[PDB]
Design a protein around this ligand. Sequence first.
Ligand SMILES: [Zn+2]
Length: 315
Amino acid sequence: EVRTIKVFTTVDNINLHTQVVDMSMTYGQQFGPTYLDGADVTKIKPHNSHEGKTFYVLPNDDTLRVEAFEYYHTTDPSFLGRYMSALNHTKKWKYPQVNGLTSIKWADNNSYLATALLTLQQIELKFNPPALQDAYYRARAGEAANFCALILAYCNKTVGELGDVRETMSYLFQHANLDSCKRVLNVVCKTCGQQQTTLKGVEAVMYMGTLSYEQFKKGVQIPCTCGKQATKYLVQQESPFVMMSAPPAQYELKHGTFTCASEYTGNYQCGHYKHITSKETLYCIDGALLTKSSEYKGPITDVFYKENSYTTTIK
Ligand SMILES: [Zn+2]
């Protein structure tokens, strides 16, 4: 009009798109929903200090649609808005190094994210979306704000919302390369006989029902459709880790028999997570807080174990 500045729009913060904006109109009137490092500036008119800065927008043409899918591996229409909304919060969190790992200082009910982030740094896992690759690299270095906002966006969780570690890990594992992972199970019923099943990928590394990998190898009791209790046990495992999950229950964690674990104190509407890692001793990381003990007992929900190749001796 009479007065303009040059800004750049983006969906991935790498590929920039030159724009000339009218300082008399809001960003929303010109771009649609618009964000400046997570802050919603849709209703704001351009400032002088905005010249040359990069703004996120929603993927509103074909070029941006392709850039956003290639970077994030999602076409959920609300993804970018939810990522920006989360980032406006996570950029204000603190990410202390605790016993050599990036943690998160407690804020905004984020304890499930802290133990998920701590867990990732202890298992062998490679992400597929460049957005996660790039943000996870930064998180390992201690700048985890973008990674944490992406976890929230990928899980369709908002800042402050109750989260579950197992479900969160499931979303992240969908976006990781677990194609090599393989699990063979056998289920034995004294009435019906035996039935083997093979699982691949994410389903090959997660199990819900018991925390103990050794018990999974010996056999766990599950219902059979005939009504009797059958025994399910692990026949073969090919993966760099496994994750064993269960409803929270008092459970004893022995030094040297697991990699790390999550503990949940509370109920189905309200609770708090802590992280336990087995190193030279047992360390309990609760956000920024750190304690140690030689033995540990608590309401454990998830335990992670190292693996490479396992074959049963059960005939
Ligand atoms: Zn049966």
